[PDB]
C-alpha cells in the first residue's frame, strides 16, 4: 500500500509510456532481481501483493529491495454519471513501468528458493518478466 505522503498537485494527465527504460536498468543493491519486458501500469496494490508473496515464501532470511514507487495518480468517475462535467476523484496510485526496468531485488544465499520466490512474485504481476543476476 505504497502511497506518497503528499503531492504538489493531486491530478495529472495521461503519462507517456513510450521508449526503453534507461534508469535502473542494471541491478545493484544485492545479488538477484527481476526485470520486466512490456509497457504497463503497475499499481500499489500489485506491489503490496508481490511483496507479501516474496516475504510469505522467503520467510526468515534475506531482505527485499523495491526500485519503484507508485506515486502517479489516476482518476475515475463513478458509474451512472454523464461524461464530462470535470475530472473524477483519484482512486488508485500507479507506477508506470518501462521495459527492462528492475522491479524487485533479492539477496538470499541459495539459487533454488531464490528463483522460486522470484517466480512467485512473477506470477502475481500483470506483465512478463525474467530473473536477472548480479553477474552481467
Amino acid at each position: 500500500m505504497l502511497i506518497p505522503r503528499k503531492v504538489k498537485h493531486r491530478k495529472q494527465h495521461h503519462p507517456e509510456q513510450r521508449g526503453i527504460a534507461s534508469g535502473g536498468t542494471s541491478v545493484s543493491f544485492g545479488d538477484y532481481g527481476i526485470q520486466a519486458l512490456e509497457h504497463a501500469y503497475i499499481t500499489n496494490r500489485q506491489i503490496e501483493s508481490a511483496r507479501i508473496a516474496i516475504n510469505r515464501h522467503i520467510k526468515r532470511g534475506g531482505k527485499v529491495w523495491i526500485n519503484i514507487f507508485p506515486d502517479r495518480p489516476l482518476t475515475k468517475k463513478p458509474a451512472e454519471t454523464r461524461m464530462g462535467s470535470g475530472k473524477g476523484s483519484p482512486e488508485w496510485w500507479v507506477a508506470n513501468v518501462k521495459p527492462g526496468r528492475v522491479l524487485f531485488e533479492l539477496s538470499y544465499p541459495d539459487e533454488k528458493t531464490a528463483r522460486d520466490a522470484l517466480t512467485r512474485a512473477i506470477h502475481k504481476l500483470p506483465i512478463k518478466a525474467r530473473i536477472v543476476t548480479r553477474e552481467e
Binding site: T81, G86, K87
Partner: protein, 79 residues
C-alpha cells in the same frame, strides 16, 4: 457534483519578434518579455514594460557577455 476551476487569461503574444541579421527601423521594438531575459546593449533602450527596442538603424546582433543575453544594433554601412 461540479468543478470550480476553468477560468483563464488572455494571451499578450509575448516573445522575440525581431531576429538577428535583418534590418530594422528607428524605434523598432525587438523583444517583448516580462523580466530581463535579454539585456540592452549599444543603441538599445528599455521600455516601461521591460521591452527592448532599437535607437539606431542597422542590423540586430545577439550575443553573450558575462553570462548574459544582450542585443545590439550594428551600424550597417551606407551604400
Amino acid at each position: 457534483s461540479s468543478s470550480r476551476n476553468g477560468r483563464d487569461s488572455a494571451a499578450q503574444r509575448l516573445g522575440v519578434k525581431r531576429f538577428g541579421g535583418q534590418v530594422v527601423k528607428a524605434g523598432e521594438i525587438l523583444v517583448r518579455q516580462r523580466g530581463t531575459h535579454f539585456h540592452p546593449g549599444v543603441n538599445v533602450g528599455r521600455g516601461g514594460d521591460d521591452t527592448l527596442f532599437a535607437l539606431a538603424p542597422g542590423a540586430v546582433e545577439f550575443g553573450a557577455k558575462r553570462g548574459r543575453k544582450t542585443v545590439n544594433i550594428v551600424p550597417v554601412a551606407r551604400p
